[PDB]
Amino acid sequence: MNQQKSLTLIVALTTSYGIGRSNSLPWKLKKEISYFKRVTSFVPTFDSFESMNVVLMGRKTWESIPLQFRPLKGRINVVITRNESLDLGNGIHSAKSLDHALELLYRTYGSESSVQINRIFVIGGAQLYKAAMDHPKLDRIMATIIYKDIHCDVFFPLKFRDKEWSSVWKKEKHSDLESWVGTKVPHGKINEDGFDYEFEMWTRDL
Ligand SMILES: NC(=O)C1=CN([C@@H]2O[C@H](COP(=O)(O)OP(=O)(O)OC[C@H]3O[C@@H](n4cnc5c(N)ncnc54)[C@H](OP(=O)(O)O)[C@@H]3O)[C@@H](O)[C@H]2O)C=CC1
Ligand SMILES: CN(c1cnc2nc(N)nc(N)c2c1)c1cccc2ccccc12
Structure with a gap:
């Protein structure tokens, strides 16, 4: 009753796989955020x-997002934490692992629910991305590649753009990125x- 939808990971990273520094992003890019908002929010009009x-x-x-911008509007938000007592406010969902999040969602938003789920994104950080890369349903990476080896202290866990992973992960054509993103x-x-x-989309076979 669960393992039916694929997971999509969305990330902005340097050419050295850097994703974070001092508990924040190593850059301030407003339009990169607008793309993240666009992709994570888009549902085909009919649906x-x-x-x-x-x-x-x-x-x-979740704690890194200035309060002004949380929760992320127009999307169902779920925070992964073993802190059973952390109070999210506003109902925001909380779960103890990636798979417990998936079960919670399917329970909450089933055929008996006014709200239905379209796509599921994993949006960071390194620790949750490591679980997502190990998950058998993760098949897509929306990657923003940043061409500067900006100093970071947190890194993306699997070098999916490198030669070692190139029989499994492949970069799709821009038109395919667009047809996917809507x-x-x-x-x-x-x-x-x-x-x-620049924006890229990478996929692998389940
Ligand atoms: N460049 C990008 O695209 C992105 C960059 N980042 C950067 O990532 C960095 C934060 O990454 P990181 O430190 O890894 O933090 P995470 O955001 O992965 O949060 C880690 C915490 O989340 C909970 N958690 C994460 N994974 C699991 C799991 N698999 N099972 C149970 N609990 C889990 C735990 O919460 P608890 O301790 O409460 O139990 C853990 O302490 C920052 O620098 C941030 O700016 C973040 C998103 C995007
Ligand atoms: C978690 N996060 C963030 C930002 N940009 C991202 N970009 C990409 N391409 N992918 C992600 N997962 C992002 C996450 C954020 C970090 C800091 C401030 C944010 C404000 C609005 C939306 C997201 C914010």
């Missing part, structure tokens, strides 16, 4: 009357703050 997407995140990520997405290099970045 958008009743269906929403879900963002799964680690408790340090809208036209900026193609090629964007420079918001002194370095280039």
